[PDB]
Amino acid sequence: NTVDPITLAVVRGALETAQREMTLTLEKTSRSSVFNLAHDYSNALFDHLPEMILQGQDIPIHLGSLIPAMKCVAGFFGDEIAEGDVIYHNDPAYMGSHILDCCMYKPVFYKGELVFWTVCKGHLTDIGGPVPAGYNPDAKEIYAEGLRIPPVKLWAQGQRREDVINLLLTNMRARAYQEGDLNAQYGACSVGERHLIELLDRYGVDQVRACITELKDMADRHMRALLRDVPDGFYSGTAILEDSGHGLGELSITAQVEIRGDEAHVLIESPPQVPYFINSYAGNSISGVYLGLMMFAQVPPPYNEGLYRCVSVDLGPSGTLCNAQEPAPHVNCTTTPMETLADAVRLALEQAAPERVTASWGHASGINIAGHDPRNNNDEYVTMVLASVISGAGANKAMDGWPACGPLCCFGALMSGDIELLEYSYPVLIHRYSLMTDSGGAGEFRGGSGTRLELEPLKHAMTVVGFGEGRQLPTAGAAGAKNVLLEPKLGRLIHRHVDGEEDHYIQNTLLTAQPGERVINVNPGGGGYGDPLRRPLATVLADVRNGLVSIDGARLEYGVVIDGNGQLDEAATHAHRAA
Amino acid sequence: YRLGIDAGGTFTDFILADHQGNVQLFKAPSTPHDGTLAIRNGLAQIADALGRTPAEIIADCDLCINGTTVALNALIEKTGVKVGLLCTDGHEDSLEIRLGHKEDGHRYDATYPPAHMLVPRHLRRPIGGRIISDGSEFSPLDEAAIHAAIDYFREQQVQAVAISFVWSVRNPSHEQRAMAMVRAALPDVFVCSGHEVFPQIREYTRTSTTVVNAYLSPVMGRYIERIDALFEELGAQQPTRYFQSNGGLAPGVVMRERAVNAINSGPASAPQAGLCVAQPFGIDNVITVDMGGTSFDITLSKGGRTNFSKDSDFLRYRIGVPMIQVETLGAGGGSIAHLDDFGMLQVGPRSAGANPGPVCYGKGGVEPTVTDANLALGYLADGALLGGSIRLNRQAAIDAIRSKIAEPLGISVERAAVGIITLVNLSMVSGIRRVSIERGYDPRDFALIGAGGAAGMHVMRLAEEIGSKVVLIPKVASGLCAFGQILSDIRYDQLTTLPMRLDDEFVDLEQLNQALQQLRERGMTNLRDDGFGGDNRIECQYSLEIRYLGQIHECSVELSCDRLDRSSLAALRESFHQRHKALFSYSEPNSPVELVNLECSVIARLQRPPMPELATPLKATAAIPAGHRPMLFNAQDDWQDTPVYNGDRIEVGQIIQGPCVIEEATTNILVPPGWRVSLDPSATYELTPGH
Ligand SMILES: [Zn+2]
């Protein structure tokens, strides 16, 4: 109650400024824009005690993965850190991203007190699995995936812990990239500290932390006030995955959401964990459920822990797909299990909120991680993020869904590489990066169509996918989306310079390509909204002529039939609309 | 001998001057739908200054400089040219891809509906040919697709053709054959080409620029037909000149017509104007903050190359053509005191404007504004901002600040009044950062230059947070947007690409030098056909843009001597290293390998303009302290009787007393405590902490 409102807004806005400063430090140097996994990071400010005070949540893969991140990092180092130190980790012990996402932690000291932590993550090129992607389908003795890093100091009171930094430099296929990117993490964390120290100087911890507690309360009350306006009761969602574990079908994520007025409690109930890198751990599943929430409430605002003070989560017993402990020793996929998890949670929350039901996205389905010995006599490696960029922003009561949206597991902040940006940087021909026909949704509002990435190696190239869910696509739209006849993704290889056509169920083995041979993967599009017989007639005609839906499509999906004729045949239009 | 036209969209700024250097200002607002009103309805009034014939007197002007951004309006009005696209097979719809996502953060929503298309896949004609990263023709140009697409373009009534091919920036023969095929099909059809608009890397940006230029260029064509006719029929001796976003006057009478370099230029002269205001004071690096009740426009001149920009994104369309980097952030004077239902006093998102007006104006004003808090602080009394029906109400602002901001926030009327303004000033600080820190270093070295309208109410406060020692206020409020375009000389930006490594390999000196001197020849030819100043000295400053291996975004490097070799090659990297250092952290260099792009901008310094200046009799400034006003500056909390001065009768600058407000018939200047100000002969108030 002694929190001055003017100075409250000033404090929060200054924090927003520092967040942008750090995010830009990484944005233009980190190589995680079109070469490392694009925008697979979020920088965040955490409290004296491990509570997140502000996240500029740009990508939600770091939505609930950061809250119980500081718990174990800061709590395992009780008193024994000091000004100038950094802790570094990526491991999913009780937290953490897929272990290619590693991150640096710096605590801020002020005249002898610990005031807040700065956290700087970024997606790295390699982590040291037998597979250059780090995304390794052979998950025997799950230690096959790569190098796991518990809390280890890589800076100590202002100096490099060279002893260990060189332990981490090896076991990784990139060296200088890794090195520069850790340099950029230290830089970003340093400016994050400098501005905030300026804040403590202008205000004093007595003011900054008072206003911060107030902001946590503001987030808490905001989320609780929203929850007051949805009915109390027990709701559930259930959605499946089948193209998993050599394509073996498996049971669903059962997301029960129990809402009592101000608060909601979330149970998960997943099937048993697997010998595949799509196992999930604590922070991963937490981000999944939080994404279930965010997909229909709101994208924009600034974020902190307060938001989730009335959202309690319970993933179920350890050793299952959603909550693993050491019994599944590794995970590279915060993509495969999490998509189904997020769908289920959102389906529950929308079962409570018919007001805000949206259509499902394509999951992104589509990775292709490629590179090898170039024309430059070195190692050149990347994930073809392009292969997995765009499905379609589902479809809403008032939206066709943009086919320019990112991860498709996720809000969409991901950014594809441009062609020339890639053909100089990589020894390939990017043969096609075009958009699909009859790959999006079917409804009163259809979904966007996805990508066709057709890639050709110039001298030698390897191809790694392993990713699941490409034939049985549970992307179904809003209870009336039809999906009468549509193409999913196929991981296809044309080899031997003859019409190879080795069609792979997306869980691809390590493939290779010779000059002239082509690897193709496509991005399955988003769902549909409602009944497509109600999609505007001129709109369906345009959409067919636009070259995203064929006549063969239109006749069966929308009940708008075109012929080798001008407009649409008055009667052929309605003859097919019995249902 | 000079006329300048600054169509600002609210009024029209008409700038007229002769050998007196007198900044004679006229107004003539024009309908958004046709601009011939400014010319013919302004020239009648310039006849009224001496009593000379308005048809005769334009003949006495050696320059008619018209900055207008009707191309921006064309992008806005959903009005343009039905554009055909010639594109490379497999990448025909990349324009619609827009690199995945880039949209969350600048304009935002829950259900962002971005990217209304300029090409709808009806005009997305692919051509089967393909080349690669070194200029090798992997597959030849598909002339069949081109012919069929031309017939189809005739079918769909296409009006302009944009062409953007893969990797043509290093082997443009494919685009050249296609453009030849179109122009040689003998259609009355303007044709753009990638290598002839923005020949650099990142195809999406090149294609977007090409398609926008196809969308707009012939609109500017018709405009130049009408306006060249207007001015040459009104008696102008010299070719007409038009103000660009590069700071110079090319269009209409040159060998290159391109609207993409005319999009939202308008008041991009702001730094050119800032230096023309500040240079008699000896300030090297300056920042202008021009604002009205509409928005805030912030820009530097030098230091980090804030002088220019990167691949800009105009409104939803990615335009790469080099422009001066400025920041337009939010609503300024007539902005609303927004207070959300989330407990956050986020004053400043949306402009009340003049139409509902501030609560001051009473024309429908409900929400308190920056004007409303400004009056609540005692900065305005009777009405001294704009030339019309002003209708100054006062207490409604105080009570509205109370009940709409102060009362619900649990803060007093005085606190909310000061706080609205605090948050606005901090927003201006943030805008300053977007170009000062993000492109360089501590603004402590620069002078702010306020001008126009509401700037005088927040510059000082803003300077106090920015750290500027010197604040400059042109006494002629409209002087900034006038000087910066009137003193515009000839400026040609000529660019190209050259992937070449400076480290890890021996630089091919002959090749790098060749590309640099060829850009010089391109500049020489640009002036050859625009008009080369007679034994007039011109300058080409080189810029090389390089990066560390594996990064995406480069950094700029200045190049002074006109040819380059080893004894200055290594220092080149030094220029880069510190530069990268200055933007990111304190020690980067291990292998600053890759160079990407090369640029030379030729400047023909042709202006020989007159400027007004004063002289002084004595030391009195006796009768300026025009009464007193109860004023609250946030630093007192007692409302001292702070003095009010009449800015129009102030004798040649004598040192001013402490905290005060200077009101002129035109505008209003704050002077917070601790500052000392005098009116320099150059018609600029110098404000400096002399206390
Ligand atoms: Zn990641």
Residue numbers in the entry:
A (entry chain B): 2 to 580
B (entry chain A): 6 to 696
Quoted from the paper:
It is composed of two subunits (CapA and CapB) and sequence‐related to other ATP‐dependent enzymes involved in lactam hydrolysis, like 5‐oxoprolinases and hydantoinases. Activity assays with lysates of Escherichia coli cells producing these proteins indicated they are subunits of a caprolactamase (EC 3.5.2.‐x) that catalyzes the first step in the catabolic pathway: the ATP‐dependent hydrolysis of the lactam ring to form 6‐aminocaproic acid (6‐ACA). The crystal structure of caprolactamase shows an (α/β)2 tetramer, with the α subunits (CapA) responsible for ATP‐dependent substrate phosphorylation and the β subunits (CapB) for hydrolytic lactam ring opening.
The CapB subunits form a dimeric core with an interface area of ca. 1350 Å2 (Pisa server). No ATP or ADP was observed in CapAB. Its core structure is similar to that of the α subunit of acetone carboxylase (XaAcα, RMSD 2.3 Å with 580 matched residues) and to the β subunit of acetophenone carboxylase (AaApcβ RMSD of 1.8 Å on 580 residues). However, Zn2+ has a negligible anomalous signal and was therefore tentatively modeled.
